[PDB]
């Protein structure tokens, strides 16, 4: 019955997602069985009502990230295909790492993929870029923690108005790409917490 529950990412939940983007052993295959099992008992795809079964989405301030991380606003179920494409999209760069000949360069977590990823997360309306209603919903939930109301309203309007590089009063791929030329965030998209 009821209990303290209180989940936690122990070396088991970490090692699992870690090998998902770190490797591809069975440690994750099993993790997909329980996760995908949340399908009320389907065991094939996952819908919004299933992700909430985890204490992360039900406690996330935006979660528009997890929601669009498994599938955009058009499908009602994410198959095992994206299950591993999303949780693994955090693989550390190892092909374009200055080298030009590894041994297994697969398309995943690449530059163009980095934008496509952070994009799906902020791409709630699918306008092809982060609109102001989307960017603001997050930007505000990320600074509202200590920003007044009229202060946030003016910090959000100037934020999307000053970064507006495509001039679409929206962003996702352009000033983001221009920003990577200053910071290799592509490798940052990797969980480790080791050193």
């Amino acid at each position: 019955m009821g209990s303290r529950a209180s989940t936690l990412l122990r070396d088991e939940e970490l090692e699992e997602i870690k090998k998902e983007t770190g490797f591809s052993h069975s440690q994750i295959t099993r993790l997909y069985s329980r996760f995908t099992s949340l399908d009320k008992g389907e065991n094939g795809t996952l819908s919004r009502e299933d992700f909430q079964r985890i204490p992360e989405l039900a406690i996330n301030p935006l979660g528009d990230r997890i929601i669009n991380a498994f599938f955009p606003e058009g499908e009602d179920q994410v198959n095992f295909r994206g299950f591993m494409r999303t949780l693994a999209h955090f693989r550390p760069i190892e092909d374009n790492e200055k080298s030009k000949d590894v041994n297994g360069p697969e398309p995943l977590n690449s530059r163009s993929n980095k934008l496509h990823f952070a994009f799906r997360l902020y791409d709630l309306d699918k306008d092809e870029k982060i609109s102001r209603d989307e960017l603001l919903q997050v930007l505000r939930m990320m600074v509202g923690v200590n920003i007044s109301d009229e202060q946030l309203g003016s910090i959000a309007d100037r934020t999307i108005q000053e970064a507006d590089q495509d001039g679409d009063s929206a962003i996702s791929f352009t000033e983001f790409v221009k920003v990577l030329e200053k910071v290799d965030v592509e490798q940052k998209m990797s969980i480790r917490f080791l050193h």
Binding site: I17, T86, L87, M142, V185
Partner: protein, 43 residues
């Protein structure tokens, strides 16, 4: 002190994309990984 100031193009002013992308990439990365799973009560 030694040196001077207002010399060649110094550092650029803060950027909205940097501050927001830094906290967003950090919150969104650890925010979607905290999911993992391994807790299906199967009740």
């Amino acid at each position: 002190v030694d040196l001077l100031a207002v010399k060649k193009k110094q550092e650029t002013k803060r950027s909205i994309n940097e501050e927001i992308h830094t906290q967003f990439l950090d919150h969104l990365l650890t925010g979607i990984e905290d999911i993992c799973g391994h807790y299906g009560h199967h009740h």
